[PDB]
Design an enzyme around this catalytic site. Sequence first.
Site, mmCIF file in Angstrom:
data_model
loop_
_atom_site.group_PDB
_atom_site.id
_atom_site.type_symbol
_atom_site.label_atom_id
_atom_site.label_comp_id
_atom_site.label_asym_id
_atom_site.label_seq_id
_atom_site.Cartn_x
_atom_site.Cartn_y
_atom_site.Cartn_z
ATOM 1 N N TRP A 50 57.621 54.393 122.611
ATOM 2 C CA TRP A 50 57.002 55.574 122.809
ATOM 3 C C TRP A 50 58.210 56.802 123.286
ATOM 4 O O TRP A 50 58.072 57.954 122.740
ATOM 5 C CB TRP A 50 55.816 55.289 124.027
ATOM 6 C CG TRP A 50 56.766 55.255 125.244
ATOM 7 C CD1 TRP A 50 57.042 54.114 125.815
ATOM 8 C CD2 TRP A 50 56.911 56.308 126.307
ATOM 9 N NE1 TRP A 50 57.800 54.262 126.818
ATOM 10 C CE2 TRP A 50 57.520 55.695 127.427
ATOM 11 C CE3 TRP A 50 56.855 57.552 126.328
ATOM 12 C CZ2 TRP A 50 58.139 56.245 128.405
ATOM 13 C CZ3 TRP A 50 57.551 58.349 127.441
ATOM 14 C CH2 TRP A 50 57.938 57.537 128.523
ATOM 15 N N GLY A 76 65.782 46.703 112.059
ATOM 16 C CA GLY A 76 65.490 45.298 111.814
ATOM 17 C C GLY A 76 65.556 44.408 113.081
ATOM 18 O O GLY A 76 64.955 44.539 114.003
ATOM 19 N N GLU A 119 67.547 39.779 108.811
ATOM 20 C CA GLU A 119 67.875 38.517 109.492
ATOM 21 C C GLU A 119 66.771 37.676 108.570
ATOM 22 O O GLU A 119 65.906 37.375 109.180
ATOM 23 C CB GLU A 119 67.860 38.406 111.048
ATOM 24 C CG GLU A 119 68.732 39.271 111.499
ATOM 25 C CD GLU A 119 68.992 38.912 112.903
ATOM 26 O OE1 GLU A 119 68.551 37.965 113.388
ATOM 27 O OE2 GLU A 119 69.687 39.799 113.669
ATOM 28 N N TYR A 120 66.906 37.206 107.345
ATOM 29 C CA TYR A 120 68.195 37.504 106.727
ATOM 30 C C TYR A 120 67.772 37.533 104.980
ATOM 31 O O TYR A 120 66.696 36.936 104.727
ATOM 32 C CB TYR A 120 69.360 36.396 106.749
ATOM 33 C CG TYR A 120 69.520 35.981 108.354
ATOM 34 C CD1 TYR A 120 70.567 36.441 108.939
ATOM 35 C CD2 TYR A 120 69.007 34.857 108.479
ATOM 36 C CE1 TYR A 120 71.034 36.156 110.116
ATOM 37 C CE2 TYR A 120 69.156 34.486 110.098
ATOM 38 C CZ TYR A 120 70.216 35.246 110.611
ATOM 39 O OH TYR A 120 70.164 34.865 111.792
HETATM 40 C C1 LIG Z 1 70.291 41.394 116.164
HETATM 41 C C2 LIG Z 1 69.263 40.533 116.814
HETATM 42 O O1 LIG Z 1 68.246 40.160 116.022
HETATM 43 N N1 LIG Z 1 69.324 40.325 118.146
HETATM 44 C C3 LIG Z 1 68.355 39.307 118.795
HETATM 45 C C4 LIG Z 1 67.567 40.064 120.127
HETATM 46 O O2 LIG Z 1 66.634 40.947 119.391
HETATM 47 C C5 LIG Z 1 66.659 39.120 120.702
HETATM 48 O O3 LIG Z 1 65.914 39.482 121.689
HETATM 49 C C6 LIG Z 1 64.220 39.813 121.699
HETATM 50 O O4 LIG Z 1 64.128 40.871 120.889
HETATM 51 C C7 LIG Z 1 62.851 41.114 120.881
HETATM 52 C C8 LIG Z 1 62.827 42.421 119.699
HETATM 53 O O5 LIG Z 1 62.376 43.428 120.610
HETATM 54 C C9 LIG Z 1 62.001 41.374 122.262
HETATM 55 O O6 LIG Z 1 61.005 41.602 122.172
HETATM 56 C C10 LIG Z 1 62.676 40.167 123.246
HETATM 57 O O7 LIG Z 1 61.963 40.510 124.550
HETATM 58 C C11 LIG Z 1 64.294 39.998 123.111
HETATM 59 N N2 LIG Z 1 64.537 39.068 124.281
HETATM 60 C C12 LIG Z 1 65.495 39.454 125.478
HETATM 61 C C13 LIG Z 1 65.863 38.080 126.110
HETATM 62 O O8 LIG Z 1 65.839 40.264 125.138
HETATM 63 C C14 LIG Z 1 67.797 38.192 121.304
HETATM 64 C C15 LIG Z 1 66.821 37.086 122.246
HETATM 65 O O9 LIG Z 1 65.775 36.737 121.331
HETATM 66 O O10 LIG Z 1 68.146 37.308 120.178
HETATM 67 C C16 LIG Z 1 69.277 38.173 119.356
HETATM 68 O O11 LIG Z 1 70.051 38.641 120.079
HETATM 69 C C1 LIG Z 2 74.077 29.254 113.407
HETATM 70 C C2 LIG Z 2 72.503 29.412 113.473
HETATM 71 O O1 LIG Z 2 72.008 29.723 112.379
HETATM 72 N N1 LIG Z 2 71.717 29.184 114.413
HETATM 73 C C3 LIG Z 2 70.520 29.606 114.459
HETATM 74 C C4 LIG Z 2 69.919 30.487 115.651
HETATM 75 O O2 LIG Z 2 70.421 31.724 115.506
HETATM 76 C C5 LIG Z 2 68.276 30.369 115.868
HETATM 77 O O3 LIG Z 2 68.204 30.865 117.092
HETATM 78 C C6 LIG Z 2 67.503 32.378 117.427
HETATM 79 O O4 LIG Z 2 68.505 33.267 116.919
HETATM 80 C C7 LIG Z 2 67.772 34.728 116.933
HETATM 81 C C8 LIG Z 2 69.184 35.643 116.159
HETATM 82 O O5 LIG Z 2 70.052 34.808 115.459
HETATM 83 C C9 LIG Z 2 67.581 35.139 118.430
HETATM 84 O O6 LIG Z 2 66.946 36.405 118.208
HETATM 85 C C10 LIG Z 2 66.477 34.031 118.566
HETATM 86 O O7 LIG Z 2 66.239 34.343 120.127
HETATM 87 C C11 LIG Z 2 67.023 32.658 118.675
HETATM 88 N N2 LIG Z 2 65.991 31.596 119.030
HETATM 89 C C12 LIG Z 2 65.854 30.896 120.222
HETATM 90 C C13 LIG Z 2 67.021 31.374 121.278
HETATM 91 O O8 LIG Z 2 65.034 30.045 120.558
HETATM 92 C C14 LIG Z 2 67.809 29.097 115.882
HETATM 93 C C15 LIG Z 2 66.155 29.094 115.719
HETATM 94 O O9 LIG Z 2 65.473 28.723 116.758
HETATM 95 O O10 LIG Z 2 68.105 28.269 114.592
HETATM 96 C C16 LIG Z 2 69.664 28.213 114.741
HETATM 97 O O11 LIG Z 2 69.780 27.497 113.562
#
Ligand SMILES: CC(=O)N[C@@H]1[C@@H](O)[C@H](O[C@@H]2O[C@H](CO)[C@@H](O)[C@H](O)[C@H]2NC(C)=O)[C@@H](CO)O[C@@H]1O
Ligand SMILES: CC(=O)N[C@@H]1[C@@H](O)[C@H](O[C@@H]2O[C@H](CO)[C@@H](O)[C@H](O)[C@H]2NC(C)=O)[C@@H](CO)O[C@H]1O
Length: 369
Positions: A50, A76, A119-120
Site C-alpha cells: 500500500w 518477481g 525464479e525460474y
Molecule cells: C530473490 C528472492 O526470491 N528472495 C527470497 C525472499 O523473497 C524470501 O522471503 C520471503 O519473501 C516473501 C515474498 O514477499 C515474504 O512474504 C516472506 O515473508 C519472506 N520471508 C522472510 C524471512 O523474509 C526468502 C525467504 O523465503 O528467500 C529468498 O531470499
Molecule cells: C541450489 C538450489 O536450487 N537450492 C534450492 C533452494 O533454493 C530452495 O529453497 C527455497 O529457496 C528460495 C529462493 O531460492 C527461498 O525463497 C525459499 O524460502 C527457500 N525454501 C525454504 C528455505 O524452505 C529449496 C526448495 O525448498 O530447494 C533447493 O533445491
Amino acid sequence: YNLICYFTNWAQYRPGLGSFKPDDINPCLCTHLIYAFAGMQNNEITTIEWNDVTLYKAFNDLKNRNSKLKTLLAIGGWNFGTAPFTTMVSTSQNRQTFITSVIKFLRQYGFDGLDLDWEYPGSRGSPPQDKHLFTVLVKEMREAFEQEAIESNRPRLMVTAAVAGGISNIQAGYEIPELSKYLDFIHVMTYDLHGSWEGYTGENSPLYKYPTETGSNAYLNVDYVMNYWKNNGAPAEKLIVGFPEYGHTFILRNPSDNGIGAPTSGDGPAGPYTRQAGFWAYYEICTFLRSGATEVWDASQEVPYAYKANEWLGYDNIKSFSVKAQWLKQNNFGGAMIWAIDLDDFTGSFCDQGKFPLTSTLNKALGIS
Ligand SMILES: CC(=O)N[C@@H]1[C@@H](O)[C@H](O[C@@H]2O[C@H](CO)[C@@H](O)[C@H](O)[C@H]2NC(C)=O)[C@@H](CO)O[C@@H]1O
Ligand SMILES: CC(=O)N[C@@H]1[C@@H](O)[C@H](O[C@@H]2O[C@H](CO)[C@@H](O)[C@H](O)[C@H]2NC(C)=O)[C@@H](CO)O[C@H]1O
Ligand SMILES: [Mg+2]
Ligand SMILES: [Mg+2]
C-alpha cells in the site's frame, strides 16, 4: 567492484526492532540498492504494498546522500511463481506491453534500472520454451532501454537479473552466452544451497564443497556455481556473487550428531522477528550465539555453523564474508550482492559488532568507500 544490496518491502511489518524501511539504510554502504519487489498485472509492472510509492521516494532519496549510488527495482522473486512471466513472454505483444510499462514506471519513481527475478524460466512449472523466450525478453528490454536513452537524452536504464544457483535450474533456464551479451549484471543466488528440505544439516552458502561430496552434491558451493556461469559464457566482470545475511535452521534428530550432514527433521525453528520456519536473520543468529550455542568453523567450506541442544544453524559471519570477498576478488568477479540488508544487524544492538556488521565487512573488502 560493485556491492549490490537488496531491500525488501515487507521488512516494515516485522515486530519491534525488526522493522526496517529505506530511511534505515546507510546510503554509503552499497554501490547499488535493489528494491524487492514489484509485481505484475495484465502484463504491466505494478506496486504490491500500500505504501510502495512512499517507500520508493524514501529509497531513491538515499541518492541525495551519495552521488554515485544507483537504484534498481526488482520484479518477481521466489513467491511470485512463474505463470505471470510465462504469459508475459509468450507473445511479442505481451512483452512490449511489459517493457513499455517498465520504462514509464522506473522513470516516474526514480529508479536506474530493472532487476529481473524470474525464479525460474523452464522450472517450477515454466515450460521449456521459456528458456529461449527469457533471452528474447532480455534482448528486447536491453534494446528498448537503449532506445529510450536516445529518445530521452538520459543515461540508459540498467537491466540485471537474479539467476539460479542450482545447476538443474541453470541448465533448464538460461541461454548463458546470449543472455550475458544483453544483461548489465548477473546476480547469482549462491545461497540456499543446503537447508532442512534435504533432511540433514548443511551450509547455506559454503565457498567450497565438503571433502566427501561427489557428483551433484559437489555442485552445492559458491566456487562451482560461479565458475559454471563463467565457463558457460558469462564474463566474470558481469558476474556478481550472492552473499546471504541470514542462515538456515534445522532440528537435529539426535543432539549428539551435530556435524555436517547430521540427520534432521521438520522445517527448522523460526525466529521471533522473521517468523518463518527454517530461516534466521543475522541479528537473530547473534541472539542464539550469545545464549551459549556451540560454534564450529567448517574449515573445508570456509563458513561457520552452530548448535545448541537439538537446534543447528548453517550461516555466514564476518570471517566467512571476508574469505569469500577475497575469493571473488582474486577470481575477477564484478562484486557481491547481499540478500538482504534488512537482515543485517542494522541497529548494531544485537551482535555488538557495530552497525551493519556484515554489509560493512563487504564495503571495506571491496573498496567501496
Ligand atoms: C530473490 C528472492 O526470491 N528472495 C527470497 C525472499 O523473497 C524470501 O522471503 C520471503 O519473501 C516473501 C515474498 O514477499 C515474504 O512474504 C516472506 O515473508 C519472506 N520471508 C522472510 C524471512 O523474509 C526468502 C525467504 O523465503 O528467500 C529468498 O531470499
Ligand atoms: C541450489 C538450489 O536450487 N537450492 C534450492 C533452494 O533454493 C530452495 O529453497 C527455497 O529457496 C528460495 C529462493 O531460492 C527461498 O525463497 C525459499 O524460502 C527457500 N525454501 C525454504 C528455505 O524452505 C529449496 C526448495 O525448498 O530447494 C533447493 O533445491
Ligand atoms: Mg509493526
Ligand atoms: Mg548414535
